[PDB]
């Protein structure tokens, strides 16, 4: 069981508070605004995201996926 957190956070400063907190909960950065990690927590994840981002302005997707779907992703670039 995996999950992805993908975010669109307007305030520069809120964006890296969130990045910092996602690392702390053990997720790993895969791109500038996306992290992945293993199923562990959930309720804390949502609370963290809600407390940090501007909910009228920002968008965060927290998406479950199976391990085999993540494994079969295609990654283009660096």
Q: How far is the CB of 27 from a second copy (least distance, A)?
A: 14
| Phi, psi at 23, each rounded to 5° | -60, -45
Contact string 17-46 vs Cl ion (x = CB under 5 A): -------------x----------------
Q: How far is the CB of 2 from a second copy (least distance, A)?
A: 10
Q: Which of residues 14-33 bind a second copy (CB under 8 A)?
A: 30-33
| Phi, psi at 17, each rounded to 5° | -55, -45
């Amino acid at each position: 069981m995996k999950l992805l957190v993908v975010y669109d956070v307007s305030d520069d400063s809120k964006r890296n508070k969130l990045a910092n907190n996602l690392k702390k909960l053990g997720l790993e950065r895969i791109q500038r605004s996306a992290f992945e990690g293993d199923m562990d927590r959930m309720k804390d994840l949502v609370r963290v995201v809600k407390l940090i981002v501007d909910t009228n302005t920002d968008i965060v997707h927290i998406i479950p996926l199976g391990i085999r779907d993540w494994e079969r992703r295609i990654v283009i670039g660096r």
